[PDB]
């Protein structure tokens, strides 16, 4: 029916394909001749990479007899001699034409698989125009040819020429989603079949739990997971005929693998390497508000987009709070945009990266995406002043677009130049705002130094008393506090350095 | 809008009509334009938004606009909606920087008659009337509609009854509170709806909505 072959999770799409594509190649030729209808001569199926497009193409080829598929990929076609970039697109149709001319209407179906159709075949109006014209004149031209079928696969369907998508050239258009919970269960069933019949899979593994634990897995990462678990088991063993793979191997392999549409733990973990100390009452309120907004986004029906701004004095430790709020939510898709990643690229590459990261957040059920700085991304310098308009306009457009279909998003941006944003007139894109004030007190410093154990209580008391008698209006961020504490620790005497540093810093 | 559509359909000399719907930001202009478009029946309707010219290059944007306009000249009746027009010509008020080529293209393309005996109606929205005045581009439009804000409490009550939030008692309490808690009241529909939705979650009682409306206004 559909799953007797190796494809799981794709049910509706395959019914559509079977009804529209192979509903005229199965019936007796007499009936179809009486009806007076031709055959479909194209198929464009698009979606995120690594989801099972080539597999379905090859299975379609196999299930209908047909010769071996002829495979090609976009950028390989081009050459650097006149008339060679289009000769390659002409050599793919020779054999089918010859067989059609020789045999007639009893020929055998031929298949041609095209990969990355949006790299060369872009709207015309150069080598590109010639290539598009040469394919256009060959797919449907003056000479009839109805013993062929060409499949095309792509990830961006809104760049292909507008005449290559007309009934007669590429008639059927299909979309491939990511697997659902049942899709993952079925994929697991298909993949763990050799180890099942051959009696080398323990009786403790419960694939339902494994499917439930894997979220946003793409269907190929499952294959990697199972293979890695099997390799782990064998390598642990080396009784060679008594190998058994248990739950522990699978769980370890799962722990090792990192999905492509999942959390990026390392960055969000190194962003908070200094630790989260509750030095006052504000921190709890900030975190509570963050949690409130997370919950609102999760449980709403009409609120499918929420953009949040967090701002305050420099050094107040703003990115750490955002990272902690993100790390205590549980969403399956978390991503970060920081100046470190972008540095070194050109403006065009910067825009491309900022756009692609926003186009991968519309293919998952629940997401959360963090933007850092927002003033160094725009290249701001106060003399003249200077900055980049293109990136600014890109970010402005991206912060107001609702996600497609039924999805959800929570953008969270940090800044420390409120006034500049006000001048640029960009403050209408944000829904709610949070402020992060810095330390103005002495008990806070005492709490910080007890939590960091700067010294024994004797020196701590002495230094706090000295500062109380000297500095009345202590006002500094938490980064400078920590760095000064460390510097004093590695230096000699508390009052000699710590007090002097604090006095010169406040 | 209905009058203008009817004029463009059944006439002899009017073969190109422009418009300009302008008002304060958040007043809900694009919704009105879309509603006027959906109740016409014209065979051909298309829309140009900043959401589609995202991440492109300038030349690509010009080519896209050119192709759209060219495709609009091959059918008997047509309509064409344009959004912003201060964001397509990316405008930042400091310097002030913007793009001139796209501006000139749009300025030349809004005064060209369709070939032969075709007809065309164009609706373009904006929120920077003063900027357009300064650019000296206000001569390309044949008329100008205006969209104002909300300026009464009964309108808020109507919005509430339509949004299923008041529950009668809440209506009375919140209206009475805001009667003396705010002398002047002016807010767009978008922000009002957002405030209602966010108020629904926590403390459905009048307090939350009162604070939200007071701070927003
Ligand atoms: N609430 C907090 N309690 C304790 N430490 C904190 C807190 N918030 C931030 N930090 C510390 O701040 C350190 C660095 O702060 P971070 O660089 O995030 O600050 P920032 O103000 O966003 O930076 P920038 O100066 O680049 O604008 C981290 O090592 C983290 O431990
Ligand atoms: N006449 C109306 N009656 C009821 N709701 C309306 C009306 N006009 C607009 N809306 C609402 O406005 C919301 C969308 O606002 P819209 O996009 O039209 O605003 P806008 O003026 O284009 O905004 P902006 O200036 O921020 O781009 C929708 O929720 C729509 O229902
Ligand atoms: N629905 C599925 N069922 C079983 N295996 C799948 C499925 N989808 C993808 N795969 C696995 O992914 C690989 C197929 O490559 P594919 O993802 O089609 O490449 P691309 O999608 O980039 O063309 C094979 O290893 C195949 O087993």
Swiss-Prot record, chain A:
Residues engaged in binding ATP: 47-54, 312-319
Biological processes, Gene Ontology terms: autophagosome assembly; endoplasmic reticulum to Golgi vesicle-mediated transport; Golgi to plasma membrane protein transport; inter-Golgi cisterna vesicle-mediated transport; intra-Golgi vesicle-mediated transport; macroautophagy; SNARE complex disassembly; vacuole fusion, non-autophagic
GO cellular component entries: cytosol; Golgi apparatus; Golgi stack; mating projection tip
Molecular-function GO terms, alphabetical: ATP binding; ATP hydrolysis activity; phosphatidic acid binding; SNARE binding
Record's keyword annotation contains Oxidoreductase: no
Complex formation: Homohexamer. Binds to SEC17.
Job of this protein: Required for vesicle-mediated transport. Catalyzes the fusion of transport vesicles within the Golgi cisternae. Is also required for transport from the endoplasmic reticulum to the Golgi stack. Seems to function as a fusion protein required for the delivery of cargo proteins to all compartments of the Golgi stack independent of vesicle origin.
Protein name, UniProt field: Vesicular-fusion protein SEC18
Organism ancestry: Eukaryota, Fungi, Dikarya, Ascomycota, Saccharomycotina
Gene, per the UniProt record: SEC18
Full protein stretch here: 235 to 758 of 758
UniProtKB/Swiss-Prot annotation, chain B:
Residue intervals passing through the bilayer: none
Binding site for ATP: 23-30
Subcellular location: Cytoplasm
UniProt subunit comment: Homohexamer. Binds to SEC17.
Annotated family: Belongs to the AAA ATPase family.
Note: Present with 5920 molecules/cell in log phase SD medium.
Physiological role: Required for vesicle-mediated transport. Catalyzes the fusion of transport vesicles within the Golgi cisternae. Is also required for transport from the endoplasmic reticulum to the Golgi stack. Seems to function as a fusion protein required for the delivery of cargo proteins to all compartments of the Golgi stack independent of vesicle origin.
Full protein name: Vesicular-fusion protein SEC18
Classification of source organism: Eukaryota, Fungi, Dikarya, Ascomycota, Saccharomycotina
Residue span relative to the full protein: 542 to 758 of 758
């Amino acid at each position: 029916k559909f799953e007797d072959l190796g494809v799981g999770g794709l049910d509706k799409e395959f019914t559509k394909i079977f009804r529209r594509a192979f509903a005229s190649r199965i019936f007796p030729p007499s009936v179809i001749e009486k009806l007076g209808i031709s055959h479909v001569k194209g198929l464009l199926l698009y979606g995120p990479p690594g989801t099972g497009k080539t597999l379905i193409a090859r299975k379609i080829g196999t299930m209908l007899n047909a010769k071996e598929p002829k495979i090609v990929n976009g950028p390989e076609i081009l050459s650097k001699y006149v008339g060679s970039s289009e000769e390659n697109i002409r050599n793919l149709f020779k054999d089918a034409e010859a067989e059609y001319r020789a045999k007639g209407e009893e020929s055998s179906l031929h298949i041609i698989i095209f990969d990355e159709l949006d790299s060369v075949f872009k709207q015309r109006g150069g080598v590109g125009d010639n290539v598009v014209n040469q394919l256009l004149a060959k797919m449907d031209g003056v000479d009839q040819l109805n013993n062929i079928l060409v499949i095309g696969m792509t990830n961006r369907k809104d760049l292909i020429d507008s005449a290559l998508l007309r009934p007669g050239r590429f008639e059927v258009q299909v979309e491939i989603h990511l697997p659902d919970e049942k899709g993952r269960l079925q994929i697991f069933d298909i993949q763990t079949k050799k180890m099942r019949e051959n009696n080398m899979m323990s009786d403790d593994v419960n694939l339902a739990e494994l499917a439930a634990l894997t979220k946003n897995f793409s269907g190929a990462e499952i294959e990697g997971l199972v293979k890695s678990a099997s390799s782990f088991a064998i390598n642990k063993t080396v009784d060679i005929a008594k190998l058994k793979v248990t739950r522990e191997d699978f769980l370890n392999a799962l722990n090792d693998v990192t999905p492509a549409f999942g959390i990026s733990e390392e960055d969000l973990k190194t962003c908070v390497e200094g630790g989260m100390m509750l030095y006052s009452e504000r921190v709890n309120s900030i975190l509570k508000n963050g949690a409130r907004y997370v919950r609102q986004v999760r449980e709403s029906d009409k609120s499918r987009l929420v953009s949040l701004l967090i701002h305050g004095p420099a050094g107040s430790g703003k990115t750490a709070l955002a990272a902690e709020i993100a790390l205590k939510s549980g969403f399956p898709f978390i991503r970060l945009i920081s100046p470190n990643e972008l540095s070194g690229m050109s403006e065009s590459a910067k825009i491309a990266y900022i756009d692609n990261t926003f186009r991968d957040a519309y293919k998952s059920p629940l997401n959360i995406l963090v933007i850092d700085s927002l003033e160094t991304l725009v290249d701001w310098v106060p003399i003249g002043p200077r900055f980049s308009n293109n990136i600014l306009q890109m970010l402005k457009v991206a912060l107001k677009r609702k996600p497609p279909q039924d999805r959800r998003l929570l953008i969270m941006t940090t800044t420390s130049a409120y006034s500049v944003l006000q001048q640029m007139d960009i403050l209408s894109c944000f829904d709610n705002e949070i402020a992060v004030p810095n330390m103005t007190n002495l008990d806070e410093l005492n709490n910080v130094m007890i939590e960091s154990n700067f010294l024994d209580d004797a020196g701590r008391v002495k230094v706090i008393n000295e500062l109380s008698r000297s500095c009345p209006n202590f006002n500094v961020g938490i980064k400078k506090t920590l760095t000064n504490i460390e510097t004093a620790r590695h230096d000699e005497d508390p009052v000699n350095e710590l007090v002097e540093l604090m006095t010169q810093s406040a």
